[PDB]
C-alpha cells in the first residue's frame, strides 16, 4: 500500500533487517577506492605487489608508503584510507616488539594479524571514553611473512576478520584481479614466476605504463628477511614484461 | 508504520517489542549451519566452514575456550571473537581462584548477563553472534546455545545459522537415539544433520567441516581439515 | 645490578628497534643513551642499581 524512507545505514550500531551493520560494510565500500594490491604466498616465499598511482611528477615516489616492514619477517600492503593504515601499522610494529620483548622469540604472522584485528572491532563503544575510533577503519591489509609454519599470507578488512589467504587481491580492481588470479595461481610456484604472474595481472589492471616507478613490490622468504625491490631490480624484472 | 521505533535499542515499539533485538537475530541467519548434538558421555560441534571466498582457507568456526568448554560461532565475527576472549578470561580466572574447571552452566549465565547489558543502554548494539557451547563438567555433557537477545537455552541438540531449520527438523526426528551412541555414531549423526542443510548438489568435503569433540575423558579437541577424514568417511549418500 | 640492567637494556633495545622501524634509520648512540637515562631518571632513588 505505502512506500517509506527507512534509514539504517546512517548511525553505527544499527542492524538493518537481514541483520547486517550497513555502517561497517560501508567501510568495506571504501577499499574500492585505494590502489590495487596483490599478494601471492608460495611455498618458496611470498611476494606483495601494489600499484602506487603517482599523481604528479613533482611527487617523490619514495614518499608514497604502500608496503611497510612490520618486522624483519612480516611485510604489509595497504589499500584505502592510508591515514588509518598509519595507526594500524604502528599497532602492528608495537605489538611485534612487545611480544619479542616479553617472549624471546619472533612473533608469528597469524598472531600479528590477530592483534591488528584486535585494534579493529572497537567501532562504537563511546561509553569507553579514551581515544576510540567511533567508526570502522578504512583500510584493507595484506600481512605477508614467514614463521614456524612456513610462509603465510593474511588478509584483513575493516571488519576485524582474517583468513590464512593466498592470492588475495585488494583495491579498486580487486575482484577482476582475483578472477585473473585463481586461474593463474598454482601451488608449486617458484617465487620468480609468482612475481611474473602478479606483475602481469597488475599490468592489465593499471592506468599508466608499467615501469619501476609506477609500482613497487617486496618479498620475504626463509633466506633473507624483509626485502624491498629497488628501481634497479624493478627494471631488472620488468625487462621481460 | 513503525519506522520511528526500529532504530535504537532503547525504544520500545508501540506493540511491546524491541525491533533492534529482532534485527540482531537476523545476524545469526547470515552465518553458516552448525550443529551441536550430544550423547550421554560426549558432546560434539559439527560446523560447516564458509565456502564464500575461493583459494583462501575457510574461516574458523570452532574455537577452543578451555580444556572442557568449546564454542561454535554463527554470527558477526567481531562479536564472536569479542565474546570468546571474555569466555577465556572467565575460565582462566575460575581455574586461578578455585582451582577447578568452571562449570558450563555458570559460564553460560555469565554470558547471558554480559550480553544483556548492552541491550538496554543507549549507543550500543546487541552482540550479533549466536554461540554453540559444548562442555563437560561434573554433570556430564551440556549443549547451550546463545542468541543475540541475551537469552541462553539448554539444548540436547540445536543448529543455528543459514537454513538451520532443516537440521533442526532432522535432529528432532532423531533425538531419542542420541543418548546411547558411541563417538563414531554421534559424529555421523551430527554430520548428517549438517548435511541436510546443504543443497543436494554438494556433499560435505573434507575442506569445509570442522568437527570438535569434548566428553568424559577426551579434552575439547578441534579436528580441522584432512584430519576429519576418519569421522567423515563411511558417511552414506543421501 | 644484573636484573635491573638486563631489563632496562632489553626495553631500550625494543625502543631502538621501534624507532628504526618508524624513521627508517638506525638510531644514534647519543639518542639511545638519552632514552635510557630518561627511562631510569624516573625511579630516582627508588632502589635501581644500574651502571650501564
Amino acid at each position: 500500500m505505502f512506500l517509506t524512507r527507512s534509514e539504517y545505514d546512517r548511525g553505527v550500531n544499527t542492524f538493518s533487517p537481514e541483520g547486517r551493520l550497513f555502517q561497517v560494510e560501508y567501510a568495506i565500500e571504501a577499499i574500492k577506492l585505494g590502489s590495487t594490491a596483490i599478494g601471492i604466498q608460495t611455498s618458496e616465499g611470498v611476494c606483495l605487489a601494489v600499484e602506487k598511482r603517482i599523481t604528479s611528477p613533482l611527487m617523490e615516489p619514495s614518499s608514497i608508503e604502500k608496503i611497510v616492514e612490520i618486522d624483519a619477517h612480516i611485510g604489509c600492503a595497504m589499500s584505502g584510507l592510508i591515514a588509518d593504515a598509519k595507526t594500524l601499522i604502528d599497532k602492528a610494529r608495537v605489538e611485534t616488539q612487545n611480544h619479542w620483548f616479553t617472549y624471546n622469540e619472533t612473533m608469528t604472522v597469524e598472531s600479528v594479524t590477530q592483534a591488528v584485528s584486535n585494534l579493529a572491532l572497537q567501532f562504537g563503544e563511546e561509553d569507553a571514553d579514551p581515544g576510540a575510533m567511533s567508526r570502522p577503519f578504512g583500510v584493507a591489509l595484506l600481512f605477508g611473512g614467514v614463521d614456524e609454519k612456513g610462509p603465510q599470507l593474511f588478509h584483513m578488512d575493516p571488519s576485524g576478520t582474517f583468513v590464512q589467504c593466498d592470492a588475495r587481491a585488494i583495491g579498486s580492481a580487486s575482484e577482476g584481479a582475483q578472477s585473473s588470479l585463481q586461474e593463474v595461481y598454482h601451488k608449486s610456484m617458484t617465487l620468480k614466476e609468482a612475481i611474473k604472474s602478479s606483475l602481469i595481472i597488475l599490468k592489465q589492471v593499471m592506468e599508466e605504463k608499467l615501469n619501476a616507478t609506477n609500482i613497487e613490490l617486496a618479498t620475504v622468504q626463509p633466506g633473507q628477511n624483509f626485502h624491498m625491490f629497488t628501481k634497479e631490480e624493478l627494471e631488472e624484472v620488468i625487462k621481460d614484461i | 508504520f513503525r519506522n520511528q521505533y526500529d532504530n535504537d535499542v532503547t525504544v520500545w515499539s508501540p506493540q511491546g517489542r524491541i525491533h533492534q533485538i529482532e534485527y540482531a537475530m537476523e545476524a545469526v541467519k547470515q552465518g553458516s549451519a552448525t550443529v551441536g548434538l550430544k550423547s550421554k558421555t560426549h558432546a560434539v560441534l559439527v560446523a560447516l566452514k564458509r565456502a564464500q571466498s575461493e583459494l583462501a582457507a575457510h574461516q574458523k568456526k570452532i574455537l577452543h575456550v578451555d580444556n572442557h568448554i568449546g564454542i561454535s560461532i554463527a554470527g558477526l565475527t567481531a562479536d564472536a571473537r569479542l565474546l570468546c576472549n571474555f569466555m577465556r578470561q572467565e575460565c582462566l580466572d575460575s581455574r586461578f581462584v578455585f582451582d577447578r574447571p568452571l562449570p558450563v552452566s555458570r559460564l553460560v549465565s555469565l554470558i547471558g548477563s554480559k550480553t544483556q547489558i548492552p541491550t538496554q543502554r543507549y549507543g550500543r548494539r546487541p552482540y550479533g553472534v549466536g554461540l554453540l557451547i559444548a562442555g563437560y563438567d561434573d554433570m556430564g555433557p551440556h549443549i547451550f546455545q546463545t542468541c543475540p537477545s541475551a537469552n541462553y537455552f539448554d539444548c540436547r541438540a540445536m543448529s543455528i545459522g543459514a537454513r538451520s531449520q532443516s537440521a533442526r527438523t532432522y535432529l528432532e526426528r532423531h533425538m531419542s537415539e542420541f543418548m546411547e551412541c558411541n563417538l563414531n555414531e554421534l559424529v555421523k549423526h551430527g554430520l548428517r544433520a549438517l548435511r541436510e542443510t546443504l543443497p543436494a548438489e554438494q556433499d560435505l568435503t573434507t575442506k569445509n567441516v570442522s568437527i570438535g569433540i569434548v566428553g568424559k575423558d577426551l579434552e575439547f579437541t578441534i579436528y580441522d581439515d584432512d584430519d576429519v577424514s576418519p569421522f567423515l568417511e563411511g558417511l552414506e549418500e543421501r | 645490578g644484573a636484573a635491573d640492567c638486563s631489563f632496562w637494556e632489553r626495553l631500550l633495545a625494543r625502543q631502538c628497534r621501534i624507532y628504526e622501524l618508524r624513521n627508517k634509520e638506525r638510531i644514534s648512540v647519543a639518542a639511545a643513551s638519552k632514552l635510557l637515562a630518561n627511562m631510569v631518571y624516573q625511579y630516582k632513588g627508588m632502589g635501581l642499581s644500574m651502571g650501564t
Binding site: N98, T102 | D93, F96, V97 | -
Partner: peptide, 19 residues
C-alpha cells in the same frame, strides 16, 4: 569476596635475601 586474586594478579604492560 574480599580481594580474591582476580586473574594473573598484575602483570599487564610491565614495560614502564628475603626477596
Amino acid at each position: 569476596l574480599l580481594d580474591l586474586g582476580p586473574g594473573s594478579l598484575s602483570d599487564g604492560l610491565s614495560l614502564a635475601e628475603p626477596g
